[PDB]
Amino acid sequence: EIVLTQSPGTQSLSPGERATLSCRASQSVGNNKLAWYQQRPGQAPRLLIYGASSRPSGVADRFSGSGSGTDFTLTISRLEPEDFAVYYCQQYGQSLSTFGQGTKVEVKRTVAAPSVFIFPPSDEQLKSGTASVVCLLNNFYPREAKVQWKVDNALQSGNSQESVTEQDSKDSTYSLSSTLTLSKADYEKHKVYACEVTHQGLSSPVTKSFNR
Amino acid sequence: VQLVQSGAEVKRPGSSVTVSCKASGGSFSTYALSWVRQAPGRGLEWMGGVIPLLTITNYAPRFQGRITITADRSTSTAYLELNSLRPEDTAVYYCAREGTTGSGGKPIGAFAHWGQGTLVTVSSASTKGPSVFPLAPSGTAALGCLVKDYFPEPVTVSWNSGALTSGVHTFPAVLQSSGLYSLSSVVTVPSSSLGTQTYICNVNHKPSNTKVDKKVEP
Amino acid sequence: NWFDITNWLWYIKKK
Ligand SMILES: [Cl-]
């Protein structure tokens, strides 16, 4: 099996800048049968380059491919807004075709600390026997952030889940939502519900909390 | 060349799924048709392919023993069968056909033509509509809705019937231990607007016919 | 390489 390594897995760049993306193969790729695809969230992949350097008629000429053997590169001469997307390499020089893990080209902007909000369970939900507490980390950059839930200062595990939005097309930020879920009966055993947030833009962790 | 796939399906663990891919435009029999999947938040994985005229399949070793790819020349339709399904098989499955170069139809191997994808969800869960709970607001306030305990995907959310989009964040769903999904949608607005302006989240879960327009207030 | 078969097929089916 040929392993294709795309490193780094993320590049943070500005519109108008050049990008070069590496695809290194664990063995020589037969006849330079190396393709590159673009994929945006919610869309099928789209072929940009095939045979290492050939470009299909429809594809913008700011995309170019080069390299041979085990060492391939996709070059984007000048990043347009629509070029911020995920790029996959693929080898098809032997019957077992493989893909790289992808490189996400995202927009670099200034560091932005999250604005943090906490929401107690609604009265409506509490009537139903369950308590969900939500923490929002809004409009931060870069994407790396951490939330920890504490209930009367006891660190929680196994009772929360989170997800993160795609980078905002206008302000280049991310947001994150985390939900802590307990039975009503368990929720009523404790007083202070807290979400503690860590991020590059924060010199020390920020806690938002409420008292049940 | 247009490839059109069959619709989303929910499959029980241990079952087999069949996904179809109908091609229109160009020739079907002499070009290689492959299947590529993508699990949630993960990369693309080539599964296998078929050359219809020759009836020559080619399967990735990881799927050899669980996959069958067939082609019906009379309908220009290719089929993926995957057996012994497990939760790890939950993914969007794409059919992908090789491109051509020049005017003479010469094939390029690489995948120029892609279907729209088919989400196959491997689960023991039954169709369930969400409860929709407000996330009430406490110069900027946040408010939102929690769309809890639904199955299967997807759910859509708008605010004020689509009139409110600035500052709205609708998050990817999470899959809970129950095998039901939950998602949240939030919006930030000026605090001064909370007295006067109405904020309503429009939640649509087609499979359960859950359509809730939830007014969120302080 | 299975990925080369259709090129062969294309070439031999030309006239
Ligand atoms: Cl393009």
Side-chain angles (χ1 to χ4, degrees), chain A residues 46 58-60 63:
Chain A
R46 184 172 68 93
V59 172
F63 298 98

Side-chain angles (χ1 to χ4, degrees), chain B residues 30 49 56 58 98 104 106-107, chain C residues 2-3 5-7 9-10 13:
Chain B
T30 60
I56 297 176
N58 171 25
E98 71 180 327
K106 184 185 206 263
Chain C
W2 181 93
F3 292 96
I5 291 171
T6 56
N7 182 246
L9 185 61
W10 170 79
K13 277 171 155 283

Side-chain angles (χ1 to χ4, degrees), chain B residues 12-29:
Chain B
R12 296 290 176 244
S15 71
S16 298
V17 67
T18 300
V19 182
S20 70
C21 176
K22 184 169 178 73
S24 72
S27 147
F28 171 78
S29 292

Side-chain angles (χ1 to χ4, degrees), chain A residues 51-92:
Chain A
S53 60
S54 303
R55 184 167 59 239
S57 79
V59 172
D61 68 5
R62 63 180 179 274
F63 298 98
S64 65
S66 62
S68 55
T70 65
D71 183 23
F72 299 89
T73 302
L74 177 69
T75 300
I76 312 170
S77 67
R78 182 188 189 284
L79 291 160
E80 298 289 324
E82 59 268 31
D83 298 340
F84 291 93
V86 181
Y87 297 86
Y88 291 96
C89 61
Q90 178 215 8
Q91 71 76 27
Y92 54 105

Side-chain angles (χ1 to χ4, degrees), chain A residues 111-116 135-138 140-150 155 162 176 195-208:
Chain A
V111 174
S115 296
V116 185
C135 188
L136 166 66
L137 285 59
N138 208 42
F140 58 87
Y141 185 86
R143 190 181 184 280
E144 292 66 43
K146 176 159 150 288
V147 178
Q148 296 194 128
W149 286 99
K150 289 170 176 190
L155 178 63
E162 64 175 45
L176 179 156
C195 67
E196 182 174 322
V197 173
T198 303
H199 184 261
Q200 175 167 353
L202 299 169
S203 62
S204 63
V206 164
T207 298
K208 302 292 183 176

Side-chain angles (χ1 to χ4, degrees), chain B residues 127-130 150-152 154-155 203-212:
Chain B
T127 302
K128 186 184 161 312
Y150 64 91
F151 185 86
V155 160
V203 176
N204 195 269
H205 184 234
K206 186 170 172 178
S208 64
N209 194 49
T210 302
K211 303 195 182 185
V212 175

